[PDB]
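Sanity check

After download, print the first record. It should look like this:
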Amino acid sequence: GSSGSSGEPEVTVEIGETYLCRRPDSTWHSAEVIQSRVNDQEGREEFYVHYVGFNRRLDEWVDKNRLALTKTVKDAVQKNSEKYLSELAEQPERKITRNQKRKHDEINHVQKTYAEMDPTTAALEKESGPSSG
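Expected structure tokens:
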């Protein structure tokens, strides 16, 4: 499928780096990006590239298209021979963690009882006597 595009990325140019600038000879020639500027009156972009292999009385602004931005544009992606990103270091990756807890307890109680006993008890002694005789 794929017919209607819904959004697209925006290219970008980097200063200090070298790019392939088109030439009026069906060819491309490297050119260091001096700086970058935008036209308000015209409403376009322009990058002052320097042809490191032509003349010193050159150095002129160019257009993004005129430059080589991604394999997308180039002389021909028939062969294409280049290395890959050359950068290795401690990649950003971390995720600490921790947790703990504890709880304890114990019931308690006391009880006691008593009883009251008898102290002491007893009787006396009855008696009697006659009279006659």
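If your output differs, re-run the checksum step. Summary of this record's structure: The longest strand covers residues 27-39.
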